[PDB]
Structure formats: C-alpha cells, structure tokens
C-alpha cells in the first residue's frame, strides 16, 4: 500500500530574504604608546562576506589617505569585521577621519568610497 | 598605551562606487587574406572581469550568427578585452554586422543578445 499523493506547487508571492541585515555600525579604539598607534575598528551588521579596507583620510570631504595605515580584513557569516593596524604617530599626524571602505581585493582597492566613517 | 581613544561609527550620507566605469567602446579591424579573414577588436571601458563572445551575424540589427566566427576573451580588471579570430572569407560572405555579446562561460552560450555592434 504505497499511499502516493501528487501535488502541483504554487509560485508563491512573498520572497523576503533571511540572513544578515546590512546595517553598518561599530566603534574605534586608537591607542598611542611610545610613538606607535594601534587602531581596532570592530564593526557589526556589515555585508556577510566582504573585504573592508580602512585607512586614515587627511583633512581637505575628499582628502588624501595616508595609505601607510591600510587595515584590511574580511567579514564572517553574520557580518563582523575586526580591522587592526600599526602606524607611526608622525605618519598619522594631520589625519581627520578614519574612513572604512569596501575592498575589491585582499591586496586593498576601494570598491566603495566610505560605507562608514568616524571623526578622529 | 599611555593614550587611549574610543569613537562610535557614522555611515556617512552617500557611499559612491569606484574602479572601472561601464562605458562600452570598441575598435574593429578586419584584414581578409587569401580565403581567410583575421579580426582584431579592442573593447575598452567594459565590465572588469567578464567574458566577451563575438560573432559575425548575417542580415535578417537582427539575424543569424555565423557560429564559425566566434571569438572569446576576458576583460582584464579595468574592462579591457581584445578579441582575435580567423575565419575563411567564404563563410562570412553574407555577414552584415559583428555583434559583441557577453559570455556565460569559457567557450559557450551568450548571456546577452548584443552589447556593442559595428555595421559591415
């Protein structure tokens, strides 16, 4: 007795997503010691799997970036990036805003031009 | 170390994408030798790392692709793809146009139905 029922399925109408909500948010901890600076930007609610280059943009907003401060990292499966970087203080002198961007490659690259920025 | 710092993040107002700009341009160059035809087409401003299948479509704009004139290549990382090929001039005797399409895979079907086209 192989009770068998064949049912055609309907194409649905409600296809809302299910996973990390892209809601950028976080904090920064720039800590000076003996002429060196250690910066830790823990972000949450980011893209689930994405490289997030972050550097120090100088004042000028546009402004150049002291690229000797590029902190690179990728996110997890919920969207948690932890940028960490060591930069001489004399280098980061005259910096204005730590701008986080998106990374086209693990070698760096600025896919996006500022998904989140903090005044320093 | 002796100095600390803690800054919460702010997601700017507008984030702008950078890198290549999708501005399709091109430069077709045929050179029909003894019963043979070479075709070197240089496309700049294309999609960063995409496939670019190119054929000679007959009249009937619209009309059938001479499939024996396919040229395939990738667009580097700034959108620069170079298409070269060699086809007897007898088969392409009724070609009216050289239609460049996007590709689904290496040596395969189209993903578009003609991005850029030159009349011959």
């Amino acid at each position: 007795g192989p009770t068998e029922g064949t049912y055609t399925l309907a194409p649905q109408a409600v296809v809302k997503p299910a996973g990390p909500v892209y809601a950028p948010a976080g904090t920064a901890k720039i800590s000076e010691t003996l002429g060196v600076t250690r910066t830790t930007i823990t972000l949450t609610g980011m893209a689930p799997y994405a490289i997030y280059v972050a550097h120090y943009h100088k004042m000028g907003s546009d402004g150049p970036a002291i690229m000797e401060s590029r902190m690179i990292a990728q996110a997890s499966a919920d969207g948690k990036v932890t940028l960490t970087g060591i930069v001489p203080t004399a280098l980061i002198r005259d910096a204005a805003y730590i701008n986080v961007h998106h990374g086209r490659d693990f070698s760096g690259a600025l896919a996006d031009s500022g998904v989140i920025c903090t005044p320093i | 170390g002796p100095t600390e710092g803690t800054y919460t993040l702010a997601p700017q107002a507008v984030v702008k994408p950078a890198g290549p700009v999708y501005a399709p341009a091109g430069t077709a160059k045929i050179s029909e030798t003894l019963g043979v035809t070479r075709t070197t087409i240089t496309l700049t401003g294309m999609a960063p790392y995409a496939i670019y299948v190119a054929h000679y479509h007959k009249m009937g704009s619209d009309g059938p692709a001479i499939m024996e004139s396919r040229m395939i290549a990738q667009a580097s990382a700034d959108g620069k793809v170079t298409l070269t090929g060699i086809v007897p001039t007898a088969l392409i005797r009724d070609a009216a146009y050289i239609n460049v399409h996007h590709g689904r895979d290496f040596s395969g079907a189209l993903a578009d139905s003609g991005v850029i086209c030159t009349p011959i």
Partner: peptide
C-alpha cells in the same frame, strides 16, 4: 503621490545590489 514607497524600494534594491556584489566578491 504613492510612489514614495517606490522610491524606498528603489533605494533598498540599490543597497541590495551592492551587498550582493560585495559578499560574492569576498
């Protein structure tokens, strides 16, 4: 009129395209 919701949907899709691109690129 009522196309304000349409603008909101357009903004959501604009952000979604970038999110998909970034996740897949990563």
């Amino acid at each position: 009129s009522d196309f304000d919701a349409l603008g909101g949907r357009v903004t959501t899709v604009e952000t979604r395209v970038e999110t998909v691109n970034n996740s897949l690129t990563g």
